[PDB]
C-alpha cells in the first residue's frame, strides 16, 4: 500500500444486484465518518459530534450510487456475466475495555473477508437472541476489495454469562458462532 501521514476515503461507493443494494461512505485514517441513508436520503454520522461543524450534502452520495448502478450493468455484461465469488467471513470477539463485574462494558464483534457485502450479524446472551442496545457499522472497504464490519453489544459483566456473535453469509455452509465469557 501507499505511505502517507493521513488517508481520506471520499466518494466510496458500492452497488450490487440483484437486489438494488447500495452504499456510500467516507472514512478518515480507517474510520467511518458517515454513510448516506439511501432510504431517508440523509447523512448519518458515526459519532454525534461530527456533523456539527462540517457538512455533507446527501445528494452527492445518491449521485455516486446512481452512477455505480450505471457502471455495474455495463461491466457485468463486459465480463460475460461473471458472478461474485462468495468469501467466508472471519469473526472475532473482544471487549472494548478491561472487564469488571457489574461495570458497563462493550463486546465488539469484528467480521472480515466479507464478500459480497451482504451479511447477518447478531448477538446471543445465554443462547437467547438480543436485539436491543446493538449497534452496527457500515460495510468498511478493504484493500483487497472485500469488506469488514463491526457490531457492538453493551453489557454488564457477570460470571458464567455466555455471549455469542452470530454471523450468517452466503459463503457460509452453516452460521458461525463466536463465543465470549466473563
Amino acid at each position: 500500500d501507499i505511505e502517507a501521514d493521513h488517508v481520506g476515503f471520499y466518494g466510496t461507493t458500492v452497488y450490487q444486484s440483484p437486489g438494488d443494494i447500495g452504499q456510500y461512505t467516507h472514512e478518515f485514517d480507517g474510520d467511518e465518518l458517515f454513510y448516506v441513508d439511501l432510504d431517508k436520503k440523509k447523512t448519518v454520522w458515526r459519532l454525534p459530534e461530527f456533523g456539527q461543524l462540517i457538512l455533507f450534502e446527501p445528494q452527492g452520495g445518491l449521485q455516486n450510487i446512481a452512477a455505480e448502478k450505471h457502471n455495474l450493468g455495463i461491466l457485468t455484461k463486459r465480463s460475460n456475466f461473471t458472478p461474485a465469488t462468495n468469501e467466508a467471513p472471519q469473526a472475532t470477539v473482544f471487549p472494548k475495555s478491561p472487564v469488571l463485574l457489574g461495570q458497563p462494558n462493550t463486546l465488539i464483534c469484528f467480521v472480515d473477508n466479507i464478500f459480497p457485502p451482504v451479511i447477518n450479524i447478531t448477538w446471543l446472551r445465554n443462547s437467547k437472541s438480543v436485539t436491543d442496545g446493538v449497534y452496527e457499522t457500515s460495510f468498511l472497504v478493504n484493500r483487497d476489495h472485500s469488506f469488514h464490519k463491526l457490531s457492538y453489544l453493551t453489557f454488564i459483566p457477570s460470571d458464567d454469562d455466555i455471549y455469542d456473535c452470530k454471523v450468517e453469509h452466503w459463503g457460509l455452509e452453516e452460521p458461525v458462532l463466536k463465543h465470549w465469557s466473563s
Binding site: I2, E3, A4, D5, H6, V7, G8, F9, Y10, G11, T12, T13, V14, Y15, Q16, S17, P18, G19, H26, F28, D29, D31, L33, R46, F50, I54, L55, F56, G60, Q63, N64, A67, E68, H70, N71, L72, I74, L75, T76, K77, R78, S79, F81, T82, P83, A84, T85, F94, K96, S97, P98, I108, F115, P116, T137, V141, H145, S146, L150, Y152
Partner: protein, 190 residues
C-alpha cells in the same frame, strides 16, 4: 465547511454482481504533498484507475483497457481537479477542524493473567508509547504486545504483556505516553 465527494464517472454504454468506486486522498506533512487515486472495481477486480502520480487513467487489467481511453478523453479535466476541490479542500476545511484535533486520553489498568497485562484502552489518535518497569528499572525482556487494535468507534486499544515471577515486595509500573496526556500515565502493581 462543506465536504466534497470524489465523484464516480459514467462508463460508455456498449448469481450476484458487485461494482465499487474508491476515492482515496493521501496526505503527508499537511497538504504539502497530496495524492489522489480513483479505483473502478468489478466484483473484486480493479480494472480502471486514476493516480495523481501519473496524471491520467490507466487500465489495471484487460477488462478496463478501453475504459481508460474513454475516461481520458471524457474526464481528464474534471478528474485531475478533484485533487484540489476534493482532497485539498476536504483536508483544509473539514478534517483540520475535526478529525485532526480529536484527542482521546487512554485508560490504563494492570491485571494478572504468570503474566502481567497492561491494558491501554480508548485512546486516539493511534500514536502511543507503552513500556514496563520493575522497581523504577525498565524491563528489557519478557515483553510482548498485541497489534494496535482498532475498535471501529474512533478509539484504539493495545495490551502489553510482561512475563514475570511475583517476588514479594517487587513493584511493577506500566508507563504510557500519548499526545492527549499532559503528563505520562503510570499504574503500579505489587
Amino acid at each position: 465547511y462543506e465536504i466534497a465527494p470524489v465523484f464516480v464517472l459514467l462508463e460508455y454504454v456498449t448469481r450476484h454482481f458487485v461494482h465499487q468506486f474508491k476515492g482515496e486522498c493521501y496526505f503527508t506533512n499537511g497538504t504539502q504533498r497530496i495524492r489522489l487515486v480513483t479505483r473502478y472495481i468489478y466484483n473484486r477486480e480493479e480494472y480502471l484507475r486514476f493516480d495523481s502520480d501519473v496524471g491520467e487513467y490507466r487500465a489495471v487489467t484487460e477488462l478496463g483497457r478501453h475504459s481508460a481511453e474513454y475516461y481520458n478523453k471524457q474526464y481528464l479535466e474534471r478528474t485531475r481537479a478533484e485533487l484540489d476541490t476534493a482532497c485539498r479542500h476536504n483536508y483544509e476545511e473539514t478534517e483540520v477542524p475535526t478529525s485532526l484535533r480529536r484527542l482521546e486520553q487512554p485508560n490504563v489498568a494492570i491485571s494478572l493473567s504468570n503474566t502481567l497485562v497492561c491494558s491501554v484502552t480508548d485512546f486516539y489518535p493511534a500514536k502511543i508509547k507503552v513500556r514496563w518497569f520493575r522497581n523504577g528499572q525498565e524491563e528489557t525482556v519478557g515483553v510482548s504486545s498485541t497489534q494496535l487494535i482498532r475498535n471501529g468507534d474512533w478509539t484504539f486499544q493495545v495490551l502489553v504483556m510482561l512475563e514475570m515471577t511475583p517476588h514479594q515486595g517487587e513493584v511493577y509500573t506500566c508507563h504510557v505516553e500519548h499526545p492527549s496526556l499532559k503528563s505520562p500515565i503510570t499504574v503500579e502493581w505489587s
